[PDB]
């Protein structure tokens, strides 16, 4: 019979708190980003560079609180974060994404981002179309916050990331998170919403790999132009590539 152990309940509590400590639903800090410009030769690049850089900082903060993550070597923590950062940003952004107008709504017209805004940061439909598809499919899962933070943590602690040294340790940590998620869904998610839910969640991890691949290709092209690179933040340059 499915039963969330005390430990699994503890893992969930820790991750919910970690998320609450690293995701501000008032988006107050957004006022401090370089201003968004919607007229446009990459007019949204400065604002979205800052939104992404900010988000990388928060993902790192969330990652550090994942049970087990601190047990990893510095090298492995770095590899896992560089590879997962954009995917976790895609995942965590689903909180602001709305299917009303298919945009990321962060509390005002200024900080409401649609497909044209993302295009004005340099990205093309090769990435943007499937990204919206992803946000829609993820939103429709109607995840509990418990499942949302578990999925972000499972995403970060992935054994198969390029450059991972101690794959076994990473796998052990992820398995503990996965089993927590699987047990949570069985015990705590009522039907029909729970139907095929874990499988659908794990499929989203596969979708994220493809989005990650395309993002990396487009980031390389965009960051190749020094006049774009001068407008990036140092953290973005370090994590995504310099």
């Amino acid at each position: 019979r499915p039963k969330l152990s005390e430990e699994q309940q503890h893992i969930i509590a820790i991750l919910l708190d970690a998320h609450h400590k690293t995701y501000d639903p008032t988006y107050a800090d957004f006022r401090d980003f370089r201003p968004p410009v919607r007229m446009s030769p990459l007019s949204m690049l400065p604002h979205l560079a800052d939104l992404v850089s900010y988000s990388i900082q928060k993902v790192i903060g969330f990652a550090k609180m994942i049970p087990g993550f601190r047990d990893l070597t510095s090298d492995d923590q770095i590899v896992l974060l560089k590879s997962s950062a954009i995917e976790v940003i895609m995942l965590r952004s689903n909180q602001s994404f709305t299917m009303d107008d298919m945009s990321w709504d962060c509390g005002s017209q200024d900080y409401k981002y649609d497909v044209t805004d993302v295009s004005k940061a340099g990205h093309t439909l090769e990435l943007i179309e499937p990204l919206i598809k992803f946000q829609v499919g993820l939103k429709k899962l109607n995840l509990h916050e418990e499942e949302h933070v578990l999925l972000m943590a499972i995403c970060i602690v992935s054994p198969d990331r390029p450059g991972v040294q101690d794959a076994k340790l990473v796998e052990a940590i992820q398995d503990r998170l996965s089993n927590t998620l699987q047990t949570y869904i069985r015990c705590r998610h009522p039907p029909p919403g729970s139907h095929q839910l874990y499988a659908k969640m794990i499929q989203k991890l596969a979708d994220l790999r493809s989005l990650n691949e395309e993002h990396s290709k487009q980031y390389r092209s965009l960051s190749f132009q020094p006049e774009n690179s001068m407008k990036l933040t140092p953290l973005v340059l370090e994590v995504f590539g310099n």
């Binding site: 770095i78 560089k82 140092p234 370090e238």
Partner: peptide, 11 residues
Amino acid sequence: KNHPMLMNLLK
């Protein structure tokens, strides 16, 4: 590849 800022944020 050396990541000063990432490394510092992880400490």
